[PDB]
From a paper:
In order to understand the molecular mechanisms of BusR signaling we crystallized selenomethionine substituted full-length BusR and solved its structure to 2.8 Å resolution by single-wavelength anomalous diffraction experiment. As the protein was recombinantly expressed and purified from E. coli, that lack DAC domain proteins and the entire c-di-AMP pathway, our structure represents the apo state. The asymmetric unit contains the physiological functional tetramer of BusR. The four central αCC-helices of the four monomers constitute a four-stranded coiled-coil motif, thereby forming a robust tetramerization interface. The four monomers are arranged in a 2-parallel 2-antiparallel head-to-tail arrangement, forming an overall shape resembling a dumbbell. The RCK_C domains form a dimer on each side of the BusR dumbbell. Each of these dimers is flanked by the two wHTH motifs of the antiparallel strands. The interfaces between the RCK_C dimer and its neighbouring wHTH motifs differ significantly resulting in two distinct DNA binding domain arrangements that we refer to as wHTHinhib and wHTHfree. The interface between the RCK_C domain and wHTHinhib is approx. 50% larger in buried surface area (wHTHfree: area = 902 Å2 versus wHTHinhib: area = 1353 Å2). Furthermore, in the observed conformation, the DNA recognition helix αG3 of wHTHinhib is buried in the interface and thus incapable to bind to DNA.
Residue numbers in the entry:
A (entry chain A): 0 to 210
B (entry chain B): 4 to 210
C (entry chain C): 1 to 210
D (entry chain D): 11 to 210
The structure:
């Protein structure tokens, strides 16, 4: 019921022979019109039995790469079918090559993430540089659906107290107005322009687009 | 330009005193010092320091309408003000969270690499311990061998696999023989070497 | 860790266990039927009687067999042989790694979702260097001594009288951005504000300059 | 960078309409004094807008503004070409490239994990073992020509011949005396298998 200890687990030798000779055909060592040698001579090539070599060649005969209907030897039929058979048997899709593809993927992504780390470091460097280069350049927030104090005058909202930002412009329903004043009312779906320091966008975010 | 960019001096004072209130140095209802005393504590003008506190007055954290000094109203609102004003979503902290994210992800992908190493070693070592253990594949519709019997399909030639069972339309058949047809949606059980699943895959539902 | 001069193998007794459980579960060994002697099973599997003793003890502990009889082992449950097979497969080494790899992949997808949202929020915080030209600031100087000095901006209702929103004040060499209504105007400051061209003139006429 | 800032500032004025289309600026030194910058730098600052055809300086008297539309174009490209914009785009490209790579990984590990074999679950697919202990009848022939499945209803899955355990041996495989033959089927296929080989 068990594999005998002296018995080594193997696959069918006839398939092995078929693959070897098909590989030679696909390489061109055995040309298309070229015929193979006797059934005993091919056995001598791999030091194997002639009958097993015949079965190996019967595999390729059934796969129509060669024909054995002629006693002189084996005449080759299609090199193109040999390459198709080689691609199919050597699947180039096993768990081994897929491991290599997966390892290549992980290494590429690790390199990309380090690249990302340097990119975001420099992005912070550039936000700190622009805050000094163009200190009056405006920000724009989009007052999204999750909303709390919409429909309220600016003066009543005490915006500057909690955000440190001065509201400078309002796009309300596609209408761009600069310097709107305290009685101006904001609804949802408006673009709000403001000026301040590096963190006023964050403060405006937490204050307006977060309940 | 020819100067140095600075934010509102009053906001800094407001934030400082609000933090002290939130830490508990100035408890609720307790009396504060004069606008001039804390001004000297902060090395600022009494008038500017008063406006710094006027910010918190308008934010209803304290009241100063009694002249004796400033009375604390709610520490709870001071905490809210600190959470809202101080950094909670800036690009500086977000950079740090992003870097923590990428480093954690690097560790996972490294774990993934060792996991796939061990998975290949285990599938190969297990294949010797169970050389007749079956595989199971599902034939999709993208297959040219549909409606054909195993005898002409020459499966063993091209896959090195021995079909042992076929699950066709909810009926499990063991040892089906050449007079069995493969249709879309069948489970095909087979034995072979470690690469036969791949060979079956490309042979049936690929190319 | 496994040395490069070693191998991993499943113990023979476990192989015996699964083999006999498979026979029971497929029905070759009916429930009532007795198994052969511990020595006969050892010879059939070419293993020591002691390893066969471990295999039969495996199925005994799983209540698939009982050995209180010297004649042999009596079959107990066909379904529990199937249960044992279920547990053995799902407990196999490649099964555990299969689950671990799937969990790792799932965790990494969530981490990248978190990353996507974090970089969304990170990237959104950018100020417009030039695209906004109606928001380019204007500049007046408190050059001519005017009125309402030493007062903050909110108490003056500047926007009513000039229609301008102050964005920055340079008071004696300190550039202050977003100074708020509590900020003071003195003589000799650079005053930056936003509005249109008729608001520039209005600011000027308001502060007694032009 | 100060010269770039002046260029942007004056382009902003032109684009907002502060300098009407065709209005003249004063001599470069007069506006340069308005800024806290040297006139020498300001001359290059306006040379920038001259090179982009926002203004012309061939009138020593001063600067003549040309087109508001081209000033806006300059502003748009200036924001896009600023180093904070390009890094933002690069970071977005990096994140999306990694998303696709993980998409690929998701498909690769799916195909990679699918390739497992049922060590114990397929109890109906557990093989039987027959021993050709009696050399008689069907022997020395390939199993495919032997009509094995035809007459026994069994599919041979392994053959142990002379100390070599062969998995999936194929139709071209021959049976000799003393081989262990593994096959799959039912309880009655085991009996039929055995009976077939003049064993019992």
């Amino acid at each position: 019921p068990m594999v005998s200890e002296q018995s080594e687990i193997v696959t069918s030798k006839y398939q092995k022979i078929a693959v070897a000779v098909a590989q030679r055909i696909a390489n061109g060592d055995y040309e298309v019109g070229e015929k193979l040698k006797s059934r005993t001579t091919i056995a001598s090539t791999f030091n194997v039995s002639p009958e097993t070599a015949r079965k190996g060649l019967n595999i390729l005969a059934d796969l129509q790469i060669l024909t054995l209907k002629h006693g002189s030897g084996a005449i080759i039929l299609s090199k193109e079918k040999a390459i198709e058979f080689l691609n199919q048997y050597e699947t180039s899709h096993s768990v081994a090559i897929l491991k290599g593809k997966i390892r290549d993927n992980i290494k590429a992504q690790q390199q990309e993430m380090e690249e990302l780390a340097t990119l975001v470091d420099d992005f912070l460097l550039q936000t700190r540089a622009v805050s000094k280069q163009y200190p009056l350049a405006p920000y724009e927030i989009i007052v999204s659906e999750d909303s709390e104090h919409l429909g309220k005058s600016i003066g009543e909202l005490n915006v500057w107290h909690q955000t440190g930002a001065t509201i400078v412009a309002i796009e309300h329903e596609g209408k761009f107005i600069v310097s709107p004043g305290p009685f101006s009312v904001i609804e949802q779906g408006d673009h709000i322009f403001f000026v301040g320091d590096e963190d006023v966008y964050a403060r405006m975010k937490t204050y307006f687009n977060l309940r």
